[PDB]
Amino acid sequence: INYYKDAASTSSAGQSLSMDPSKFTEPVKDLMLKGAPALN
Amino acid sequence: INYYKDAASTSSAGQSLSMDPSKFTEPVKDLMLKGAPALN
Amino acid sequence: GYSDRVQQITLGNSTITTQEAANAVVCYAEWPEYLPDVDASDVNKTSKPDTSVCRFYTLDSKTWTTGSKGWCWKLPDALKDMGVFGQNMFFHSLGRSGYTVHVQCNATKFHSGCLLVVVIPEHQLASHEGGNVSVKYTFTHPGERGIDLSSANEVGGPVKDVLYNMNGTLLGNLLIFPHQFINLRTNNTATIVIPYINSVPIDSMTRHNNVSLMVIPIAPLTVPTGATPSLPITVTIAPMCTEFSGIRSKSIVPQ
Amino acid sequence: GYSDRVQQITLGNSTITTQEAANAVVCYAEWPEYLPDVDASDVNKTSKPDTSVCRFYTLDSKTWTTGSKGWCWKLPDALKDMGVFGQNMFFHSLGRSGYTVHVQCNATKFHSGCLLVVVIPEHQLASHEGGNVSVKYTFTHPGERGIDLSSANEVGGPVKDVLYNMNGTLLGNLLIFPHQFINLRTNNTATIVIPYINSVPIDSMTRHNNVSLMVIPIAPLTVPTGATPSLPITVTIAPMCTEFSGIRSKSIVPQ
Amino acid sequence: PDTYTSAGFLSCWYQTSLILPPETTGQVYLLSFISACPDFKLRLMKDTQTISQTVALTE
Amino acid sequence: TVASISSGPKHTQKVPILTANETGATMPVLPSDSIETRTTYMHFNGSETDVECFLGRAACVHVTEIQNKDATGIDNHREAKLFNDWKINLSSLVQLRKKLELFTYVRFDSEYTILATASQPDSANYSSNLVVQAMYVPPGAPNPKEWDDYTWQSASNPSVFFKVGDTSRFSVPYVGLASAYNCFYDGYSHDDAETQYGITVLNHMGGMAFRIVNEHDEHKTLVKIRVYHRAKHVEAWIPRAPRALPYTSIGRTNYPKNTEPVIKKRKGDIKSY
Amino acid sequence: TVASISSGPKHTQKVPILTANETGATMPVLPSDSIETRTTYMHFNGSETDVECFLGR
Amino acid sequence: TKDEVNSYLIPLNANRQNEQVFGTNLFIGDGVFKTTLLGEIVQYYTHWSGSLRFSLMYT
């Protein structure tokens, strides 16, 4: 129950439960498959 | 009504109403019947 | 014609027969079983030597005399040197096991005496010094010799006072632990099956013992007239469902 | 992009990667497998330590120099002291095993040299004395050290003459045995998978070795100018599908 | 770092040995990285020993 | 539910009262196996003997004290009780300890209540109003060195601010590293020849640091902190023999030497009533 | 959720542990690519590492 | 003795056989690990569990 009118006044947000490290761990242009050779 | 998000914050648990003394009072391998001889 | 009385336990390449048993206890009514995945944490596949480790090792014999106070062995310590069980033990980082314990003591229908055979999960001993003196490692790792409660206090060792279970509790209440009596007039062996009991799924076999087996004379031994005043007590123990994990170099432990 | 050239072998808790392989040989086109019942004789259930014995042990390294004649290891001897494999070995009456052998030697594109890596089933050695002099036990059980074909004749030892394979046959014909070459210009490792080969279903691991692994320089090592004139050769070997049976007291063997 | 809770050791040795081509010399180096597997769990947040201060900063 | 059924005379070959205790069992014998009984009902459920109930009331687990005074020229705040820490335990005051050690492994959430009262033992014009800060300091966090260190910023570490005279209350989930807390541990942290025996991290519940936020007034004020702990959501395994001798140390089983007989001696015979 | 799957011996031409870090990627290698593993579950969600939680006290 | 780009470099010697390249314990919250991003984040939490990935790039 929100007792207040504005959105800033609500409690903390709830877990992204998004999670996708590939923008950080695999930003390569041509896709690399694990097990296939790195450099062909 | 829980007012809080986490489970630790809820009140005391409610009675097991489990109760089974046999693990402590009769841990024998071959079942003993009351009234039958203890050692055959 | 089956009696509670006669029994055979075959485990590995070794068999025990008793013709004067008094049933057998299975701690907490649970039988040893391997470690389920749902309970697993370490990702390593474990090693299950099976029949080469799950057989019966008979420790060296003790001598019950009228002055005996009782003896105490720790597991897996007592077996730290038995065959391949022991090797596996020093060579893996983690291991887990249940046991069948069979304590033997026969006499005649003229003797009297009664031993308590009890298994205590997590038996943390007390220092006889009091205060917060610790009990050094070696002292709680007697190996197959076990601890002799009628031996003298030593320094860095535990207290050996029987009315207090080596920890500040009374002998009389040890009966809350899985146990069985050997009453010469009834019984000649005691058998207890121990499931693996711990707060972690698998642990180190050398830094932590998870049960102490204790044999304590309670009704003093009384032999017939002009009999030799003593009887030997033998302890045979078999690891069961043993699993080892995290193999490597081979632990080096104090002393 | 798979090449015959790059490979990974993971066995137990150990992995090997080679980026310059030349395929791998599987002796007689058969892969190690356990002992089927139809072939069994001993009635004992066997023990299969699995991952604690089926991992890769790297023996101590050798040094190929321009004067090297070749080295010879026997199996299971070479592993008689590796971890739990070895313990199991001394503790059971009978055991059986296949192996993955990986011989390693890297150099540069200016070196030349070519080693023959061969596995000989039942390699009965000859006495250098001639006649019917025997080759004493110790001499055919060098352990991880193996036999160094450029060492001197010793008394009670085998002959170490390379053009004769240590038995009266010519080096040139060793190619009838499963083998692979390491030619610095091509190759940097050799891998051979050995199935268990015997005339009995299971045997003693201490009185009989069932293969000798032999590494022999054939085209002499030639290093680039002002290079150090030698390369190390390393042998890593992993028991696979090992089974032990007839556990007991623990063999005591000469020397 | 805690004992009971300790995790092991990591070592690295020559398996055969490094060999340099002709006309080349000296030491070569390895770079080493560390990251966590997708396996990883971290819990019970607290303050880092890696940063402290003695007076409030100002502009 | 019947507490006793009706039972009459017996002349059988079936004797439920003869057993063999050597077996380790306690055979479930009832009044009606050996006397003639009448029906009676239980009228009772055993509600208040549930382990949740037994361990579920607040017990005092710790009393500490800090003071508000001029820190000018104090070389060791910790030592002047300018602030104070406490590594959480349930085995320092014995009442709750004996209760928990009836079990080997125990698992529960904790609810803490902290009461703080002030004392002014020497001449003050008044009673000041102080705010206490209690910081939860998990192992590895910087520990306070002065009563007003950067540590107290507590940007990542839970802290509660309440007034002396009031009470603070919050609840912490089960923070054990294993599946349960070990009430006992017959082990070491490693196979060392001299490492401590019995005391283990398996029991570790964090640690807490207290201080007054207020600067000093002209008089000095003693604030004494009492921490209460209530187990909620309790789970207990493997019952053990109750503690008979007195305790000597946090975390060891050790009892004092030349202790006194714990079993009351009869004033009379075995035959005495 | 599985934290580790069961995996056994390997003798392949497909080597997931050899990579080229010069590319800028961190290849997602797991215990089961290089030792033999057993199944285990995560039992965990990563709740307390959410940025809302990290900056939210 | 002072932070330098050089403490990121593990040196290798040509022609050594059998010998050891480096050693370290695995207290990820201390020692070598401590300044790495992994080490640096681990330090915001009290407990960790999971697998680590250690890689070496040859130069």
CA distances to C16, D8, F28, F35 from F32, in Å: 41, 74, 11, 6
Q: Which of residues 15-54 of G touch D (CB under 8 A)?
A: 15-18, 34-36
What is the enclosing helix (H) or strand (E) of D89? helix D83-91
In Å, what is the CA distance from C88 to each residue of A24, C149, F59? Answer: 43, 30, 46
Helix pair angle (D83-91, C83-91), 10° resolution: 180
Which among G21, G28, G49 has CB closest to E38? G28
CB C114 within 8 A of CB C218: yes
The H or E element that residue B23 is part of is helix B22-25
Tell the residue number behind the tokens 């007590």, with chain if given: C233
CA torsion angle F85 F87 F88 F92 (round to 10)? -100
Q: What are the tokens at C127? A: 């220092």
Backbone angles phi, psi at C116, to 5 degrees: -100, 130
Tokens of F72: 């000018």
**Contact indicator for F92, F175 with CB cutoff of 8 Å:** no
F162, β-bridge pairs: F132
Q: Which residues contact C54 (CB under 8 A, 6 or more apart)?
A: C11, C12, C238, C239, C240, C241, C242
* Contact criterion met (CB below 8 Å) for C11 and C58: no
| β strands within D195-229, DSSP E | 211-222
Dihedral sign (CA F246, F250, F253, F256): negative
Alpha helices of chain C — where are they, by DSSP H?
83-91
Question: Which residues of F31-121 form beta strands (DSSP E)?
Answer: 40-41, 59-68, 83-87, 103-119
Structural contact between residues D193 and D100, judged by C-beta atoms closer than 8 angstroms: yes
Task: Map residue B36 onto helix, strand or coil.
Answer: strand
User: Which residues of chain D does E22 touch, with a Cβ-Cβ cutoff of 8 Å?
Assistant: 108, 110, 224-227
What distance separates the 2 farthest-apart alpha carbons in chain A? 61
DSSP helix/strand/coil, B34: strand
Query: E strand or H helix at A24, and its extent?
Result: helix A22-25
Helix or strand holding residue F51 (H, E): helix F51-55
- Residue D10 in 3-state DSSP? strand
The residue type at F135? M
Please compute Rg for chain G using Cα positions.
Answer: 16
Q: Are the CB atoms for H49 and E18 separated by under 8 Å?
A: no
Residues near E36 by beta carbon (within 8 Å), at least 6 away in sequence: H38, H50, H51, H52, H53
User: Domain range holding B18?
Assistant: 1-40
Residue F35 CB: number of other CB atoms within 10 A? Answer: 10
The Cα-based distances of F11 to B33, F14, F214 in angstroms read 19, 9, 83
**What is the rounded end-to-end Cα distance, in angstroms, of chain D?**
52
First to last CA, chain E: 37
**How would DSSP label each residue in chain G?**
-EEE-----EEES--TT---GGGS------GGGTS-B--EE-----GGGSHHHHH--
Copy the structure tokens of residue E49.
Answer: 């020993």
3-state secondary structure chain F: CEEECCCCCCCCCCCCCCCCHHHCCCCCCCHHHCCCCCCEECCCCCHHHCHHHHHCCCEEEEEEEEEECCCCCCCCCCCCCCEEEEECCCCCCHHHHHHHCCEEEEEEEEEEEEEEEEECCCCCCCCCCCEEEEEECCECECCCCCCCCHHHHCCCCCEEEEEECEEEEEEECCCCCCCCEECCCCECCCCCCCCCCCCCHHHCCCEEEEEECCCCCCCCEEEEEEEEEEEEEEEEEEECCCECCCCCCCCCCCCCCCCCCCCCCCCCCCCCC
CB C173 within 8 A of CB F241: yes
Question: What secondary structure letter does DSSP report for C83?
Answer: H
The residue type found at D98 is: G
Kind and range of the H or E element at D87? Answer: helix D83-91
**Cα D106–Cα D110–Cα D116 angle in degrees, nearest 5:** 45
Experimental resolution (Å): 3.0
Give me the numbers of helices (H) and strands (E) for chain C, helices first please.
1, 13
Residue G55 in contact with partner chain D when CB distance is under 8 A? no
Cβ D30 vs Cβ D183: under 8 Å: no
Looking at the DSSP bridge assignments, the partners of residue C217 are C115
H5 CB within 8 Å of a chain E CB: no
Going from the C-alpha of D126 to that of each of D138, D178, D197, E3, the distances in angstroms are 14, 21, 21, 56
Strand bridging mode C230-247 / F83-87: unpaired
Label the pairing between strands H9-12 and F59-68.
Answer: unpaired
* Chains G and E, touching by 3 or more CB pairs within 8 angstroms: yes
Neighbours of D129 (CB within 10 A): 14
What would the two tokens of residue H8 be?
């990121």
Which is nearest to F138 in space by CA: F199, F91, F197, F85?
Answer: F85
- What are the structure tokens assigned to F122, written together? 């020497």
Interchain contact F173–G (C-beta under 8 A): no
Cβ partners under 8 Å of residue D143, min gap 6: D77, D78, D80, D81
Q: How far apart are the first and last CA of chain A?
A: 58
Cα C151 to chain centroid distance, Å, stands at 19
Q: How far is C215 from chain B (nearest CA, A)?
A: 19
Beta bridge partners of D120: D212
Cβ-based contacts of B23 with chain F (< 8 Å): none
From residue F16, give the alpha-carbon distance in Å to each of F13, F19, F31, F32, H53: 10, 7, 11, 10, 66
C3 closest CB neighbour out of B26, B27, B40: B40
Q: Are D18 and E15 in contact (CB under 8 A)?
A: no
Q: Indicate the residue of E37, E41, E42 with minimum beta-carbon distance to G30.
A: E37
For residue A38, the distance in angstroms to the closest alpha carbon of chain G comes to 5
Amino acid letter for position C47:
S
Q: Does E have 3 or more CB contacts under 8 Å with F?
A: yes
CA–CA separation, E56 vs E37, rounded Å? 38
Widest CA span in chain D: 63
Judge if the upstream peptide bond of residue D76 is cis by omega within 30 degrees of 0.
yes
List chain C domain ranges. 1-255
Single-letter amino acid code for the residue at D152: A
Which residues in chain D are contacts of E16 at CB distance < 8 A?
A: 61, 104-106, 231-234
Q: What is the 3-class SS of C187-255, one letter each residue? A: CCEEEEEECCCCCCCCECCCCECCEEEEEEEEEEEECCCCCCCEEEEEEEEEEEEEEEEEECCCCCCCC
Identify residue H54 by its one-letter amino acid code: F
Whole-angstrom distance, CA of residue D122 vs CA of residue D80 = 18
- C147 — phi, psi (to 5°)? -105, 135
- Cα C93-C98-C99 angle, rounded to 5 deg: 120
Taking the CA atoms of C41, C44, C48 and C53 in sequence, report the sign of the dihedral they define: negative
Question: Residues with Cβ < 8 Å from F86, sequence gap 6 or more?
Answer: F62, F64, F207, F208, F209, F210, F227
Taking the CA of residue D188 and the nearest CA in chain E, the distance in Å comes to 11
Q: What phi-psi label fits residue D246: left (phi over 0), alpha (psi between -120 and 50 degrees) or beta?
A: left
The one-letter amino acid code at E26 reads: G
* DSSP-assigned letters across all residues of E28-46: EEEEEEEEE-TT-EEEEE-
Closest-CA distance of chain D to residue H17, Å: 7
Q: Could you report how far apart the first and last alpha carbons of chain F are, in Å?
A: 36
Q: Which residue of C has its CA nearest to B30?
A: C23
Pairing outcome for strands D62-65 and E9-13: unpaired
Min Cα–Cα distance to chain E from H33, Å:
8
Residue F231 DSSP symbol: E
The CATH number of whichever domain residue B16 belongs to comes to 4.10.80.10
C25 closest CA partner among C192, C154, C153? C192
Report chain H residues whose CB lies below 8 A from the CB of G24.
none
**Long-range CB pairs of H46-49, under 8 A, 24+ apart, other chains included:** H46/E43, H46/E44, H46/E45, H46/E46, H46/F138, H46/F139, H46/F140, H47/E41, H47/E42, H47/E43, H47/E44, H47/F177, H48/E40, H48/E41, H48/E42, H49/C41, H49/E40, H49/E41
In F, minimum Cα distance to E4 occurs at F189
Domain F1-273 is of which CATH architecture?
Answer: Sandwich (2.60)
Task: From chain B, pick out residues whose CB is under 8 angstroms from the CB of F29.
Answer: 34
Q: Which of H51, H56, H59 to mutate to test the interface with G (most CBs of G within 10 A)?
A: H51
- How buried is residue C249: exposed, middle or buried, by Cβ count under 10 Å (0-12/13-18/19+)? exposed
Tell me the β-bridge partners of F115: F167, F226
DSSP string, D141-176: --GGG-EETTSPP-TTSBP--GGGTTTTS-GGGGGG
Closest CA to C50 of C209, C238, C248: C238
Number of domain units in chain B: 1
Give dist(CA F144, CA F126) in Å, integer.
Answer: 30
Q: Contact C43/G4 with Cβ under 8 angstroms?
A: yes
CA distances from F246 to C167, C169, F56, F252 (A): 11, 10, 24, 12
How far does F110 lie from chain H, in Å, by closest CA? 18
Structure tokens, F67: 């003071």
Q: Residue F82 and residue F69: Cα distance in Å, rounded?
A: 7
Beta-strand ranges (E) seen in chain D are: 7-11, 14-18, 25-26, 57-58, 62-65, 71-75, 92-104, 112-121, 147-148, 179-183, 189-194, 211-222, 230-247
Count the neighbouring beta carbons within 10 Å of the beta carbon of residue E19.
Answer: 19
Experimental method: X-ray
Please determine, looking at this structure, whether the domain spanning C1-255 carries the CATH number 2.60.120.20: yes
Residue D244 distance to chain E (closest CA, Å): 30
* Segment (H or E) for D46: none
Chains H+D touching (3+ CB pairs under 8 Å)? yes
- Residue D236 has phi, psi (to 5 degrees) of -115, 130
Chains contacting chain B through 3 or more C-beta pairs under 8 A: C, F
Let me know: does F19 contact B36? Beta carbons within 8 Å.
no
Q: Find out whether F157 and C179 touch, Cβ atoms under 8 Å.
A: no
Token pair, residue F145, equals 């060195």
Give me the residue label for tokens 């060195």. F145
> Which 3 state secondary structure label does DSSP give D182?
strand
Cβ–Cβ contact A19 with D under 8 A: no
| CA C95 distance to own-chain centroid | 17
Distance CA C72, CA C212 (A): 7
Q: How many CA within 13 A on the CB side of residue C82?
A: 22
Q: Report which secondary-structure segment, H or E, holds E21.
A: none
Q: What is the rounded (10 degree) CA torsion for C219, C224, C226, C232?
A: -60
Tokens linked to C61: 């014999």
D57/G52 Cα distance (integer angstroms): 49
Q: Retrieve residue A34's tokens.
A: 């694990």
* DSSP at C44: B
Query: Which subunits have 3 or more CB–CB pairs within 8 Å of chain C?
Result: B, D, F, G
- Alpha-carbon gap, residue F118 to F133, rounded angstroms: 15
Q: What is the CA radius of gyration of chain E?
A: 22
CA angle G6, G10, G13 (to 5 degrees): 135
Number of Cβ atoms within 10 Å of the Cβ of D203: 15
Tokens 């439960």 belong to: A17
Burial of residue C252 (CB within 10 Å: 0-12, 13-18, 19+) is exposed
3-state secondary structure of C6: coil
- Written as six digits, the tokens of D217 are 């320089």
Phi, psi (rounded to 5 degrees) for F98: -60, -40
Contacts of D210 (CB under 8 A, 6+ apart): D75, D76, D121, D122, D196, D197, D198, D203
Distance (Å) from the C-alpha of residue F128 to the closest C-alpha of chain B? 33
Rounded to 5 degrees, φ, ψ at F84 are -155, 140
| Interchain touch G–B (≥3 Cβ pairs closer than 8 Å) | no
Give me the count of residues in chain H: 59
Is residue F34 a contact partner of residue F8, using CB atoms and an 8 Å limit? no
Contact between C156 and C255 under an 8 Å Cβ cutoff? The reply is no
State the Cα–Cα distance between residues F14 and B38, nearest whole angstrom: 11
Task: Test E33 with G21 for CB contact under 8 angstroms.
Answer: yes
Helices and strands: H and E segment counts in chain B: 1, 0
F200 dihedral zone (left: phi>0; alpha: psi -120 to 50; beta):
beta
Residue of A nearest to D8 (CA): A35
Cβ-based contacts of F138 with chain H (< 8 Å): 46
Q: Point out the residue among E6, E46, E52 whose CB comes nearest to the CB of F150.
A: E52
- C34 residue type, one letter: Y
How far does Cα C62 stand from its chain's mean position?
14
Q: Could you give the CA distance from residue D27 to residue D119 in angstroms, rounded to a whole number?
A: 8
Residues F260, B14: Cα–Cα separation, whole Å = 41
- Count of CB atoms situated within 10 Å of the CB of F17: 10
Between chains, do H18 and D228 touch, taking CB under 8 Å as contact?
A: no
Between CA D193 and CA D119 the distance in angstroms is: 10
Residue F206: left (phi > 0), alpha (psi -120 to 50), or beta?
left
d(Cα D127, Cα D249) in Å, to the nearest integer?
A: 33
Question: Closest Cα of chain H to F201: distance in Å?
Answer: 12
Other residues' Cβ atoms within 10 Å of the Cβ of residue C149: 20
Q: Does the CB of G25 have a partner CB in chain A at under 8 Å?
A: yes
Backbone angles phi, psi at E3, to 5 degrees: -70, -55
Residue C52, Cα to own-chain centre: how many angstroms?
20
Give the count of Cβ contacts less than 8 A between chain E and G.
26
Does residue C132 contact residue F249 with C-beta atoms inside 8 Å? Answer: yes
Sort out which chain G residues have CB atoms less than 8 A from D236's CB and list them: none
Closest by Cα among D181, D178, D187, D180 to D18: D187
Distances (CA, A) of C111 to B39, C230, C231, H47: 20, 10, 10, 59
Q: What are phi and psi of C212, to 5 degrees?
A: -115, 135
